[PDB]
């Protein structure tokens, strides 16, 4: 057991394990989003790429949390990972709305863990979240919001055409 | 005071100080235009970039006037800077129309100062405006006119789509 | 409006807009300080350069705040910018004392916004100030203090000579 | 005679010849200033260099006027060149005051020729002065004013010491 643990509450330890589960589930959701847009009957490569990149980012977030858990002397505990909430994700607009909802949920879990850390006077935990997660999340949510607005402007006009142009001229492919 | 001042009227000195104020207010207006197009619910990066670039150009114009004021032995006097005339700037078309109006106003102030300099037989002032401002202004107004025509052609067709395409295919991003 | 805003109080939003105004006014003050030292009857190039550099830094601070305001889903609102408090700034010593007073005022506004953010449990805001402003401000104020001491030591001795040597041998030109 | 002359008045032709004489006399004055500061009992190398550089600049100004005279089909006419007004030039401060007076005199002759050209509707002449002389003169006079202020600040304090420091730390050597 732990010869190193210092100022690391059982409450934070458990919440970090829950947050790892939430990041891995987000990664899984993004994997499903990504492969949906690779279907021959959907075929939006840029959209596929955008969500596959987010699957990787979320998995890396989970790995960084696990590394931190060990650095503090806590013990990683893994739970089952729930499948994503949908099997088909609709249009680019539907998908980007679902992604923003998911990110807001992750952001709220980060903020809740920051508050717990503040309450338990665990500055290392607070700084770790500040330095590696909170600003990344704000930037991502802003980028998703920007995308949502641009998609909305395009598919109001003419939906098929608008969806193609967004994929071609905004997303990387 | 001034050991160097020669052939530099009090009338020109004062008008140069007023023109500095007008350039700084134009810079401020462009700062507001730029950040409006960066809002998550507007999200036209190219448009944002175009106006941020103009904010910088106008500030540089003011600095060049101040440098000249000191080179001639006049004394810079700063006044309050009025906030921009709007808090929200509408569509790309609305914004480009407002920008052309602003530029025409600055161009008229340059022409009025050139006329004062001519009347006061101040060739250094006249040449300074000719060399650093009058042609820059004509070129900018032509570019804005070109943009306005292209935006008009696009948003007559289909407004959301047209605004996106102009931002993607004309403006630098 | 905002699809992205999360954990961002109206109180912080307003205070960020006020802080933008304070940074822009500081930039304006530094512009005036800089051009005063470029006058032919003052003629201290290093001093001019030092304050022009600070005008740029403060403007960049304002732009970073505006970027953050949009990233969080707040709305930039601009007010009139008050002219600087003086038209002439006296000696290098007078000017450096005025600059330290101004910086302390900006530092206090940063600390007050940090306290508001702490009270509203907005860790992103707190970290943003910590990461981009609070240490920059401490370093600048230390540098100004160092300068003030050196100027004082020089102009006690022999004021004209001392002011020239400080400009030549301390400030970059 | 002239197969090329067009729109070039006899009045301008004569005034250009007088201006050549004034530039050559200024060059001669600067030659004398320069060698005075090279005397073993004056020995301010930077000051010597500053005035020798101005002797060259003024000679080049005269050559450019002569080139222009031929380009327009006028005929260069040379007169005697009056010796400089002093044989010894006093201190750096005395010398810099004499130089500013001389430059103001040259600037006034340029402005008077510009006015003649304007009155005779000779835009080539007006532009030639604007492009090659008027801004050069304003910049030089500003630089001399800056120097005068710095010398004054130094030799008020302690004259010998101040004169040495200006030569060492401001002027190029
Ligand atoms: Cl499930
Ligand atoms: Cl107003
Ligand atoms: Cl005020
Ligand atoms: Cl004589």
From Swiss-Prot, chains A, B, C, D:
Gene3D superfamilies listed in its UniProt record: 1.20.1260.10
Pfam families named among the record's database cross-references: Ferritin (PF00210)
Listed CDD domains: Ferritin
PTM sites of type N-acetylserine: 1
PROSITE patterns: FERRITIN_1 (PS00540), FERRITIN_2 (PS00204), FERRITIN_LIKE (PS50905)
Protein origin, superkingdom: Eukaryota
GO biological process, one term: iron ion transport
Binding site for Fe cation: 53, 56-57, 60, 63
GO MF annotations, alphabetized: ferric iron binding; ferrous iron binding; iron ion binding
Domain Ferritin-like diiron: residue ranges: 6-155
GO cellular component, one term: autolysosome
Role noted for this protein: Stores iron in a soluble, non-toxic, readily available form. Important for iron homeostasis. Iron is taken up in the ferrous form and deposited as ferric hydroxides after oxidation. Also plays a role in delivery of iron to cells. Mediates iron uptake in capsule cells of the developing kidney. Delivery to lysosomes by the cargo receptor NCOA4 for autophagic degradation and release or iron.
Oligomer and partners: Oligomer of 24 subunits. There are two types of subunits: L (light) chain and H (heavy) chain. The major chain can be light or heavy, depending on the species and tissue type. The functional molecule forms a roughly spherical shell with a diameter of 12 nm and contains a central cavity into which the insoluble mineral iron core is deposited. Interacts with NCOA4.
Family recorded in the similarity comment: Belongs to the ferritin family.
Protein name, entry field: Ferritin light chain
UniProt source species: Equus caballus (Horse)
């Amino acid at each position: 057991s732990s010869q190193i643990r210092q100022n690391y509450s059982t409450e934070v330890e458990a919440a970090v394990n829950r947050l790892v589960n939430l990041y891995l589930r987000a990664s899984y959701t993004y994997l499903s989003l990504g492969f949906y847009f690779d279907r021959d009957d959907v075929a939006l490569e840029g959209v596929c790429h955008f969500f596959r990149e987010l699957a990787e980012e979320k998995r890396e977030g989970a790995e960084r949390l696990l590394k931190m858990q060990n650095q503090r002397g806590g013990r990683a505990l893994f739970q089952d990972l729930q499948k994503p909430s949908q099997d088909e994700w609709g249009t680019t607009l539907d998908a980007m709305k679902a992604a923003i909802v998911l990110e807001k949920s992750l952001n709220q879990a980060l903020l809740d863990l920051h508050a717990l850390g503040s309450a338990q006077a665990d500055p290392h935990l607070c700084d770790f979240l500040e330095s590696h997660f909170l600003d990344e999340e704000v930037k991502l949510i802003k980028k998703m919001g920007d995308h949502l607005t641009n998609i909305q402007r395009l598919v109001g006009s003419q939906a098929g055409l608008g969806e193609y142009l967004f994929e071609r001229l905004t997303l990387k492919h």
